[PDB]
Amino acid sequence: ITEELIARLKQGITSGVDLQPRQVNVGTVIAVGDGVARLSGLDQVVASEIVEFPPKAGRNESIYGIALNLEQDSVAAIILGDDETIEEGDMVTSTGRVISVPVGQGLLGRVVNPLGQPIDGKGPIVYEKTRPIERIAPGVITRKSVDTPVQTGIIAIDALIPIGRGQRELIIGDRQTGKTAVAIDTILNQKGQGMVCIYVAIGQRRAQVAQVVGTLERFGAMEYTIVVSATASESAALQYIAPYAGCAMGEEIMENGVMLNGQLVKDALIVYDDLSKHAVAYRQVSLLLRRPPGREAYPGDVFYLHSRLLERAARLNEEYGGGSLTALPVIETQANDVSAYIPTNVISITDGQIYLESDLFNAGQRPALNVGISVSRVGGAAQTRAMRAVAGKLKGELAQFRDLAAFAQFASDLDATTKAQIERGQRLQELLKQPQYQPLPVEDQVAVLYAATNNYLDDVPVPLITKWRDDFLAFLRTAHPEVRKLIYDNRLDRKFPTPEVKEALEAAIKEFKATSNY
Amino acid sequence: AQAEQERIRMLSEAKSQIADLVTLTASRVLGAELQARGHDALIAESLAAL
Amino acid sequence: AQAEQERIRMLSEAKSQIADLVTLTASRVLGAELQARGHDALIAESLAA
Amino acid sequence: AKGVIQEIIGVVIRAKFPEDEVPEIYNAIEIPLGNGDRLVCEVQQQLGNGVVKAVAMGSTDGLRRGLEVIDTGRPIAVPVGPATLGRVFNVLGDPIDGMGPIGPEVERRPIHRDPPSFEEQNTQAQIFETGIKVIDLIAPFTRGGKTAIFGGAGVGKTVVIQELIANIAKEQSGFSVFAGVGERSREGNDLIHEMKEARIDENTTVFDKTVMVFGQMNEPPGARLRVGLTALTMAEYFRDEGRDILLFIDNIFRFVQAGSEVSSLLGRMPSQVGYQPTLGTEMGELQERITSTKRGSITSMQAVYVPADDYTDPAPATVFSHLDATISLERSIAERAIFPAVDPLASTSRILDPNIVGEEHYRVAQEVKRVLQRYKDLKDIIAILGMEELSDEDKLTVQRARKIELFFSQPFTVAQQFTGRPGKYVPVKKTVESFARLLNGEGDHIPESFFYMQGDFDDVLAAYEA
Amino acid sequence: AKGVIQEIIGVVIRAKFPEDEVPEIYNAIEIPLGNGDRLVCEVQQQLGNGVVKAVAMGSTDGLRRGLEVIDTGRPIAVPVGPATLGRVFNVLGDPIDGMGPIGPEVERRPIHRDPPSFEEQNTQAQIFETGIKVIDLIAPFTRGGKTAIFGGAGVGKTVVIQELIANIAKEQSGFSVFAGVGERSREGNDLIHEMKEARIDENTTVFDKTVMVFGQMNEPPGARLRVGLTALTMAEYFRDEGRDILLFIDNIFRFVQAGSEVSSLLGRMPSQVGYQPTLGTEMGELQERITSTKRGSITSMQAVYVPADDYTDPAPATVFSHLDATISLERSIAERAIFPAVDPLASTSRILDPNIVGEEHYRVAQEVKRVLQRYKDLKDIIAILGMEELSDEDKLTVQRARKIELFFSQPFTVAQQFTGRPGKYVPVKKTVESFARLLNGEGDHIPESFFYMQGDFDDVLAAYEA
Amino acid sequence: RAVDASVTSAIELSAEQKERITRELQQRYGDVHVTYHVDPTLIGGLIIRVGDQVLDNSLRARLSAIQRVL
Numbered sequence A: 001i002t003e004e005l006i007a008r009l010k011q012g013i014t015s016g017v018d019l020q021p022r023q024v025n026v027g028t029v030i031a032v033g034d035g036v037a038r039l040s041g042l043d044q045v046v047a048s049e050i051v052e053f054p055p056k057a058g059r060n061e062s063i064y065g066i067a068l069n070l071e072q073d074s075v076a077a078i079i080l081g082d083d084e085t086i087e088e089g090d091m092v093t094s095t096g097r098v099i100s101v102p103v104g105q106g107l108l109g110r111v112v113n114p115l116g117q118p119i120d121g122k123g124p125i126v127y128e129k130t131r132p133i134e135r136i137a138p139g140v141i142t143r144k145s146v147d148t149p150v151q152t153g154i155i156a157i158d159a160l161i162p163i164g165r166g167q168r169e170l171i172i173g174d175r176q177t178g179k180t181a182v183a184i185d186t187i188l189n190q191k192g193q194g195m196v197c198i199y200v201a202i203g204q205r206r207a208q209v210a211q212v213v214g215t216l217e218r219f220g221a222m223e224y225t226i227v228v229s230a231t232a233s234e235s236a237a238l239q240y241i242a243p244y245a246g247c248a249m250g251e252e253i254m255e256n257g258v259m260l261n262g263q264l265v266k267d268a269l270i271v272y273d274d275l276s277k278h279a280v281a282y283r284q285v286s287l288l289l290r291r292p293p294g295r296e297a298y299p300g301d302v303f304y305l306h307s308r309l310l311e312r313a314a315r316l317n318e319e320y321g322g323g324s325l326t327a328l329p330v331i332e333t334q335a336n337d338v339s340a341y342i343p344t345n346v347i348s349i350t351d352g353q354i355y356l357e358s359d360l361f362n363a364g365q366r367p368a369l370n371v372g373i374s375v376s377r378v379g380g381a382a383q384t385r386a387m388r389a390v391a392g393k394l395k396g397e398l399a400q401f402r403d404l405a406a407f408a409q410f411a412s413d414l415d416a417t418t419k420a421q422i423e424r425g426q427r428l429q430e431l432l433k434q435p436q437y438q439p440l441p442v443e444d445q446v447a448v449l450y451a452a453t454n455n456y457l458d459d460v461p462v463p464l465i466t467k468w469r470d471d472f473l474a475f476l477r478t479a480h481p482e483v484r485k486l487i488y489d490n491r492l493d494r495k496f497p498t499p500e501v502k503e504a505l506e507a508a509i510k511e512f513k514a515t516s517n518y
Numbered sequence B: 001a002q003a004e005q006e007r008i009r010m011l012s013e014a015k016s017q018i019a020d021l022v023t024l025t026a027s028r029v030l031g032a033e034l035q036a037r038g039h040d041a042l043i044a045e046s047l048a049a050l
Numbered sequence C: 001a002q003a004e005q006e007r008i009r010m011l012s013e014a015k016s017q018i019a020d021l022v023t024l025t026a027s028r029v030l031g032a033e034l035q036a037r038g039h040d041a042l043i044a045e046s047l048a049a
Numbered sequence D, E: 001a002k003g004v005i006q007e008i009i010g011v012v013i014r015a016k017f018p019e020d021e022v023p024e025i026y027n028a029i030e031i032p033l034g035n036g037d038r039l040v041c042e043v044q045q046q047l048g049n050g051v052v053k054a055v056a057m058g059s060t061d062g063l064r065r066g067l068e069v070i071d072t073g074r075p076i077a078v079p080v081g082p083a084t085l086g087r088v089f090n091v092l093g094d095p096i097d098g099m100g101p102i103g104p105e106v107e108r109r110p111i112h113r114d115p116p117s118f119e120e121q122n123t124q125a126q127i128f129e130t131g132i133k134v135i136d137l138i139a140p141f142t143r144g145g146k147t148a149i150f151g152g153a154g155v156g157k158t159v160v161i162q163e164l165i166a167n168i169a170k171e172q173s174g175f176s177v178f179a180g181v182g183e184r185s186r187e188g189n190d191l192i193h194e195m196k197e198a199r200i201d202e203n204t205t206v207f208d209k210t211v212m213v214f215g216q217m218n219e220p221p222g223a224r225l226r227v228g229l230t231a232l233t234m235a236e237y238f239r240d241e242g243r244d245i246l247l248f249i250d251n252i253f254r255f256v257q258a259g260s261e262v263s264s265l266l267g268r269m270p271s272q273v274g275y276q277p278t279l280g281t282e283m284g285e286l287q288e289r290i291t292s293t294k295r296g297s298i299t300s301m302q303a304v305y306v307p308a309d310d311y312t313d314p315a316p317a318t319v320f321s322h323l324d325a326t327i328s329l330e331r332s333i334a335e336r337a338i339f340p341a342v343d344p345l346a347s348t349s350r351i352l353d354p355n356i357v358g359e360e361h362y363r364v365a366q367e368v369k370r371v372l373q374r375y376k377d378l379k380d381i382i383a384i385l386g387m388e389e390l391s392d393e394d395k396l397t398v399q400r401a402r403k404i405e406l407f408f409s410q411p412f413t414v415a416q417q418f419t420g421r422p423g424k425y426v427p428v429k430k431t432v433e434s435f436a437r438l439l440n441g442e443g444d445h446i447p448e449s450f451f452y453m454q455g456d457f458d459d460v461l462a463a464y465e466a
Numbered sequence F: 001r002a003v004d005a006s007v008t009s010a011i012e013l014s015a016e017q018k019e020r021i022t023r024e025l026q027q028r029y030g031d032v033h034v035t036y037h038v039d040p041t042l043i044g045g046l047i048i049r050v051g052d053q054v055l056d057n058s059l060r061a062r063l064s065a066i067q068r069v070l
């Protein structure tokens, strides 16, 4: 119907475009420092506009910058791109629009800048609405208590450190300890749990983010995940605004939702890959803007910064949509100094901690979680009733072992009861070891912990507990699918150990122990 | 599937290249047409509202 | 094959792009003085590829 | 009035006013923005010719240099009165809960007042009957005195706060005020409203008898700094009415670090850890209006976070300079299900001396501490070796220590949902007599695990001796 | 493009230009000198009215406050091409050895380029062979990977970096780009030149196949800072040519320290412990250009000097995030006369995955670590008990661990001067079998001392024959 | 006069047109300090700047706007 195109055209051009001479506001750069321009005194600029720097001779691209400090006769604007090109006297025009990012269904399974520009080279983003960055928190009456669990897929977290929809759980650790491993496992575990994952990748390497994206691609995890990226080479402004763009996307998922696997999904998960490097980027931006340095040279408002970032993660009630947004910030502690500035800030503003230690990691134990100091302050509310009932015994026994952990090299030479406790603790700790990219579904973890808590693995030697778990799981998958289905179906039951599930599980485990030899 | 996505992206990248070439050709031709056309009345457009 | 098809499509559709270039050239400035060599003439001179 | 905003550097802004009518310090200049959404600020300095530096107390993102700035002529004014009961406010005094605006008819008072003058101070210290036996005995409150609650995250702090609100609402008329300084928008904005609305010591809900003010985490440093003063201004009306008020502050260390961040933003020289140079004075402006005047009294119970674990750090040090009691809640008393999870050997209180609480109270408190200390020491004897090694008069000490530890447990009127036992309020004198009787006599022939959740010694005796 | 020098304070120079032709941010100011040579500063900050603040790149003890300066228009330009092969350069890309100046026909490129985009990045983690076995089956290389060495003050980092260049010139061609950031003149000069010229293959010295760019603690901070970028340009040329270039950086610790000094002299606000605010971004721009594109790949190793043992120090702390593999040299092993002196434990590698280096490679690497990890656990047992009270089966573990620890040592073609016998290149997949045989127990009868320095297991067998 | 301004035109401006546009800008002050530029790369357009506000009705602007379809 070309007549429709003819009617739509020929009217907007004649009397739909103002074409009115009016004077739009601009300024001129008067000093370019370390990625910071002053833009002279461009007036009528909102406190965080994005200035435009139109192309000039020797540059056919447009480079954007954030106007952060609005001084009298000076607007010190941090540049988002490369400052090699902007020169003194360059005319800069200010858009009236605050930073915005494309969001929604279309931006799914794509690697994008904080500004939303693709960096995957797979075409432009398809979208129709842009959500402004830097939004106010949901508020007081808008939220609901965290109840629905977020099955991360690794036994230690899902049993001892619950993560629920809306919770802000911190992965605090040191050097390489599996923080990205724990996060990437959590993301991979959401294949059919109605969640949209956001990875932010602040200050990482291009090769590292490429490797993570390849890992998600390999496990078919790019039909439900977004990846933002502001690598190390990128200017400090891009890293500074990266997590805010990521959580803007997450907020769009939370409020409106997206059509995932033929159903509307309003739950989101966002993993700020390094709030430590984010704070470092913000410190660079502040110090280059000559803002006053606070403790440890971080500006006075880094706490406010991470606070407004993280408090946008919430569990909206049914009135406002029922959506959710779980934040999983990650921090790179130095020498396990948890008392440093940003670690203290983030543990104070977050709802729980997942302490990853280098000692346990180098101790041969892959998942280096520290149950003693790690805490999820949501508690059992973020566990299914099944896992909640099963894991109390696990927590008690692990606590007992940690109390008597000094006797591993003296376990045999002790009381019978103490020897039994130490043996059980060693078996449980060996059981919590898990390889990488191998998430365990909730029913599987429930079955394994039901076995372990009850006196079933006592016959099993300690070094073979992991192999026992692996082949027992394979047995349940192939030999007794109905047991897994039954456990999954009544996971929410108030009294999970019902007679039917109890006897089915007992029969399955007894059959496996009879068939196998250890 | 990866091969199929590559063909789609290759066509898309070819589409972008064609669009850029067409834009450059239009700019070169637009300059020629404008010069032969003349630009006497451009001043009148600068005061429709100012 | 994709590269060969694209080159074939680009070469085959060059006239169509010229037809679109004429429409864009006509709408390039929203007008065309009659005292000119012609938008089509400039497009032919700037046909290039 | 009618200044113009000149500079915007993060939260800090500078507004230029005429030569006259320059706002004073703490004058709450408001910026019209959006649709009536005012970015209330707080002037902190006067510079040059009418330029005044102010803290954002809001987003300060949609602002542009050159906007109109309106001076209110007074510090931030917050509503005060019964109209604030059962409502939830931010630092600015606007109700953030669902209900509507307070309305112009309700009185509004400046946030920045001066503490009571020297004459108004109570010459002597009066014990505050909190009702909870362990607190009333081991770490008694002081009428108009501060208190610290160093307990584990999830050991019963909120339940204790609810019980204190219930007692101050029930026995004496009273009210309560909750100042969630830097309180998380989940564990504070929501994990509290539901708990205080469901919790009903009497027909009235704890929520209906308490004024709630939240300086949320996401708010800028100015809000977290002045939310405590907003809470104090809201409580001071009820104190001026002659009532006795409990002011609960959540993690006063967040108030300290909000002040530190504000000082750093203003460019002041840092001090001794990086904390604000005006740390003592800031902690004095707050926490000095928490005093027992002639007309009424504001008692307070302030949660405190120790940086690292340094009781010598300047923040907890300056807080301790203004503390009259300390309660160390412990999870170890929580696995053994005692509701007040208070460690009697770590919790202390200044008022626990013979002169103020009397001779008998001090004697029984010292005796309880002594037997508990003996039991703690004999931990190793009982665990390493066993009960048989315990000598005569030391088996009895441990035996009594068990019964003392259980007898500290009390059934709260707000705990009748968790456990179902009816509430009980044991007066201080009843606690003194009960514990004296338990120590110098009766209670040995009665087996332990029968002092569990009982009030006076008469209550346990009559109830569980049948 | 002609300015005038305004101020000169230390190695920081302020020049003024006409407003219409102020140099960009990273242009070379190129101050001419009377003798005929020139001082080539670089702009770092455009401030004021056509005033630029620049770093010296040179002595700056022979210039006044009015010298004319010619803006180059382009950043520091360095030669690139086969012509710049087997030549020694400084930060400005000027040949500092005795040979004549590079001709004007050699292509010159700016040192401030952009790293490869995200799309160009490659995910295939192909292993890169080195010949130092303890590096090959503890923490192997990765093409387009940032290996790094740690520890310092005596442990052989520079020597293993020379050995790698020699062995990788034996392997294929291995055109190596040595980036001497603040290298000692003795270490970098007349020892790298001497050793590389001595190391001969096919009547063409390894020196003639590698390009060396030496900054100098003696040169000002700016030269030591930008020397790494110069070497990166030199290698990026060959990467664009498609060849697999190998770039070596000496003591990135000195790169960080030079950055800190430049920042302090420039008046930048100090960050952390007096370090530059741009610590992360400088390492980002230096390290991000080292990667593997589809066409070519700049594989690399970067030596690091950790002060004492403080891995928290800002230089190693910054560089850790960019490493695909880390090697930890310890003095305790050096006291054991081990050329590699690498610690088999605490030296990881991201490609130590069954399906990247072969199925047996991962399990034999872990088994060797398991054997060595056991030896540490019972070190005190062996110490005071002299292997007594051992489980015997553990004695074999002990014996195999000591044999393994001695067998990691390899005569370095670059260590022949000190004491060693001629070097041996031990190809991976020819000596992973050797270690598998050792674990299996084929060398359970050979004495311990015969695994001292031999390379393959066949070599120690042949030695044991005699 | 008090305010400074700048003007750019694709073609070399004739004197009569220069005076015409000079007196056209009488909204602010009349014959303000105008530094007429050419910038021949500009096509059939007029970029006038007065104070810290610009006007850009040049055809390059519309060409870029159409190019945004990319």
Ligand SMILES: Nc1ncnc2c1ncn2[C@@H]1O[C@H](COP(=O)(O)OP(=O)(O)OP(=O)(O)O)[C@@H](O)[C@H]1O
Pocket: A173, A174, A175, A176, A177, A178, A179, A180, A181, A182, A332, A366, A367, A434, A435, A436, E321, E350
């Ligand atoms: N759960 C795991 N199972 C097996 N291997 C693991 C596991 N977690 C980590 N690893 C190993 O440790 C390496 C480093 O882990 P990872 O990158 O996840 O840690 P990190 O703390 O995120 O590190 P970084 O700070 O360097 O980004 C992984 O490449 C893998 O080799």
Ligand SMILES: Nc1ncnc2c1ncn2[C@@H]1O[C@H](COP(=O)(O)OP(=O)(O)O)[C@@H](O)[C@H]1O
Pocket: E151, E152, E153, E154, E155, E156, E157, E158, E159, E160, E187, E338, E339, E340, E412, E415, E418, E419, E420
């Ligand atoms: N492979 C080796 N063989 C013999 N001696 C070595 C070897 N590697 C290092 N050394 C000793 O270390 C010294 C130089 O160490 P070097 O490689 O410069 O370490 P760094 O660069 O950290 O100072 C030499 O003088 C020598 O004594």
Ligand SMILES: [Mg+2]
Pocket: A179, A180, A181
């Ligand atoms: Mg990581």
Ligand SMILES: [Mg+2]
Pocket: E157, E158, E187, E251
């Ligand atoms: Mg060295």
